[PDB]
């Protein structure tokens, strides 16, 4: 039996990161809280700035501890700006191809070809264009170049696959990302 393949997409090796910087009220970002011109696609020039500004990832802001006890003079409740993102450090990419019908030579299975090792595998996966949490293709890229660094452009996702939890002077990323390698060596 063989897979009757519809179109196919790319999945990256997504390792989830995040960062946050706290700026004071006296700073120039902060006024009576967070700028409304900060959005899930704004960046701070201040962050741990190695950041791939073209990549898939999410931002936000909140007031933090403000006081004479949290780094900013005059007891001002201060701003904390943060980005939670995914990254593909080892350039790994898998081509995923849903099987429309199994044909002689169960539902919602897909061929998962690794691209360096060319090792093949079978597993359930999302249909093209659905950043559905839980299954392979949470993150779907439209081109091998897009999956290589998870370009913001070619690639889709839910951003709730990654959680962040702020603390005082850093934050704590969480990942709900299903790993290809953890679905494709058991059924390889």
């Amino acid at each position, epitope marked *: 039996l063989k897979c009757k393949k519809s179109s196919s997409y790319f999945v990256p090796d997504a390792r989830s990161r995040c960062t946050s910087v706290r700026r004071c009220r006296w700073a120039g970002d902060c006024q009576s*809280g967070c700028p409304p011109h900060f959005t899930s696609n704004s960046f701070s020039d201040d962050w741990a700035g190695k950041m791939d500004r073209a990549g898939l990832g999410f931002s936000g802001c909140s007031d933090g501890c403000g006081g004479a006890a949290c780094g900013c003079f005059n007891a001002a409740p201060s701003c904390i700006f943060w980005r939670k993102w995914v990254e593909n450090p080892h350039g790994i990419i898998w081509k995923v191809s849903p099987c429309v019908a199994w044909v002689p030579s169960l539902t919602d299975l897909c061929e998962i070809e690794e691209l360096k090792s060319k090792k093949l595998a079978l597993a359930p996966c999302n249909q093209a264009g659905m950043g559905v949490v839980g299954k392979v293709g949470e993150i779907q890229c439209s081109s091998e170049e897009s999956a290589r660094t998870i370009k913001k452009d070619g690639c889709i996702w839910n951003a709730d696959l990654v959680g962040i939890e702020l603390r005082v002077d850093d934050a704590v990323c969480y990942s709900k990302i299903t790993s290809v390698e953890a679905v494709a060596n058991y059924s390889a």
Partner: antibody
Amino acid sequence: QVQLVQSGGGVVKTGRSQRVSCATSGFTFSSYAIHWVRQAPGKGLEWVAVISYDGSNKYYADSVKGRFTISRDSSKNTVYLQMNSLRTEDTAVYYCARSQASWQAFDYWGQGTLVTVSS
Amino acid sequence: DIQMTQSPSSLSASVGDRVTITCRASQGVGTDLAWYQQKPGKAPNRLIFAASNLQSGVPSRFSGSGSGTEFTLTISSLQPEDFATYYCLHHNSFPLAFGGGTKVEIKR
């Protein structure tokens, strides 16, 4: 500092409608999901629903699913819980609370808006 | 569906004591679990997230631990304000769910 201000409680006939609302400041509204947790009088806390950062994902407790709606207005920094075909047991203080992913724990709470549903 | 059961449903204890509430789930919930303090007719507060992380600003005498189906919240030294009802919440899957709660009353 982070704040969430409810309004819209009141009395309502068994079977009718109600809208509680939650208007937030302090943070960046369209980066956080919002949940509704309700408390009958002197009972435990009960989780009602949650809407994701963009409205795309809405999930509901099994007791109101099919009867309540959550929704959000980017411009007013507000989240709404609509309550249709209300029943007597639905009487509770409705608290709305912040959550960054739609699946994470809530951190900052609302002050509650009381809804009393009785014939 | 996942079910969070707290015990003891309520306990009576005194200032200086050590207090340990146990939240128990009917399925794995990993470390997606949180603890709340609710003084009466007030908004609950988050005490603990990630099952072990101290909500920023909650006193150091508070601590969480557990995984899977067992979680234990622990106040080393009950201070007079720590009397409240206490709730666990599992956010490992939708729908989320709270525990029953443990009321911590004064023992006399």
